[PDB]
């Protein structure tokens, strides 16, 4: 007379919040919580329910009827929020090996995040292993750098910043 509930990230199969068990007497109708409000705050939309292994489940009422045999209900959620790359404009001196520019990136989900960096000044390159721009700029001038960030669910954001390469004379 138990029912195991999971709240699952459809992209990765991971628990977004801890699984919850419900119990009752045999035949007792028990209300289960799909946690939609909490998951919305986490940047997820409620997407589907799998009750293949809980035949007593009523989706309209969000109930199970407890039986001698265990039951399982899985609620699935989709990450609908793009990653956040927080980067500002940067000045660097021509012809000097730069302190790397770290492209600070976070996300609400449970999977990978991949950045795509373009428009770098001559001498600069994106080190994807350290998620940082590295190099020695070769030429005075300003460049607009574009960073596209994509999470594993394929939500995308785009940010830009300028790199200004300056000389002392
Ligand atoms: Ca996300």
Author numbering: 495 to 663
Provide the publication's sentences verbatim.
S. aureus encodes a 2,271-residue SRRP termed serine-rich adhesin for binding to platelets (SraP), that is involved in the pathogenesis of infective endocarditis. S. aureus SraP, a surface-exposed serine-rich repeat glycoprotein (SRRP), is required for the pathogenesis of human infective endocarditis via its ligand-binding region (BR) adhering to human platelets. We determine the 2.05 Å crystal structure of SraPBR, revealing a rod-like tandem organization of four discrete modules: a legume lectin-like module, a module with a β-grasp fold, and two tandem cadherin-like modules that create the rigid stem of SraPBR. Further structural and biochemical analyses reveal that the legume lectin-like module specifically binds to N-acetylneuraminic acid (Neu5Ac), which may mediate adhesion to host sialylated receptors.
To further investigate the plasticity of these junctions, we determined three crystal structures for each of two consecutive modules: L-lectin&β-GF (Phe245–Lys575), β-GF&CDHL-1 (Ser494–Thr663), and CDHL-1&2 (Ala576–Asn751). We superimposed each of these three structures over the corresponding two modules of the full-length SraPBR structure, always with the C-terminal modules aligned. The results revealed slight twisting and/or translation with intermodule angle changes of 9.4°, 11.7° and 14.6° for the three junctions, respectively. In detail, residues Val496-Gln498 in L-lectin&β-GF, Phe571&Thr572 in β-GF&CDHL-1, and Asp661-Thr663 in CDHL-1&2 undergo slight conformational changes. The second module possesses a ubiquitin-like β-grasp fold (β-GF) in the immunoglobulin (Ig)-binding protein superfamily. The module contains a twisted four-stranded mixed β-sheet (β19-β18-β23-β21) packed against a two-stranded antiparallel β-sheet (β20–β22) and an α-helix α3. The second interface is formed by residues from β-GF and CDHL-1 via hydrogen bonds of Lys536-Asn602, Gly537-Asn602 and Asp503-Thr604. Ca-2 is fixed by Asp573 and Asp601 (bidentate coordination from Oδ1 and Oδ2), Asn602 (Oδ1), Asp645 (Oδ2), and the main-chain oxygen atom of Lys575, whereas Ca-3 is coordinated to Asp661 and Asp690 (bidentate coordination from Oδ1 and Oδ2), Asn691 (Oδ1), Asp734 (Oδ2), and the main-chain oxygen atom of Thr663. We thus propose that the β-GF module, in addition to the two CDHL modules, functions as a relatively rigid stem to project the L-lectin module outwards.
